[PDB]
């Protein structure tokens, strides 16, 4: 129930997803900088902001 | 109905027609996932002695 002039929110979904994967060599993959040479990282992120 | 009931129905209606209040409901679903597999294994095969 909305006032005769006013634009309002019915509903909405703000959805956020982040998947992170690494295939690394156990000890070597964890060397804080060099380690990125052993690891094959796959990262993913998403955002959806829906407003009605 | 009788004018007696008309006045009684008139209060029922007035109470029953009250501006029903609105509710904005935000849900927040947060999930976090990960884990570490490790497979390290060493095999020695010798023609003379034996294999593992």
From Swiss-Prot, chain B:
It is found in: Cell outer membrane. Forms a cylindrical channel with 15 subunits. Involved in a type II secretion system (T2SS, formerly general secretion pathway, GSP) for the export of proteins. This subunit forms the outer membrane channel. The N0, N1, N2 and N3 domains are periplasmic, while the secretin and S domains form a channel that is partially inserted in the outer membrane. The N1, N2 and N3 domains each form a periplasmic ring. The secretin domain forms a double beta-barrel structure; the outer barrel has a diameter of about 110 Angstroms while the inner barrel forms the central gate with a small pore in the closed state. Belongs to the bacterial secretin family. GSP D subfamily. This is Secretin ExeD.
């Amino acid at each position: 129930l909305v006032k005769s002039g006013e634009t309002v929110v019915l509903g909405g979904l703000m959805d956020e997803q982040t998947k992170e994967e690494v295939s690394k060599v156990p000890l070597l993959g964890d060397i804080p900088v060099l380690g990125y040479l052993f690891r094959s990282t796959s990262n993913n992120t998403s955002k959806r902001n829906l407003m009605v | 109905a009788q004018p007696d009931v008309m006045a009684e129905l008139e209060q029922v209606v007035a109470k029953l027609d009250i501006r029903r209040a609105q509710v904005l409901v935000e849900a927040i679903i947060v999930e976090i996932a990960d884990g570490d597999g490790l497979n390290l294994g060493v095999q020695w095969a010798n023609t003379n002695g034996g294999g593992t």
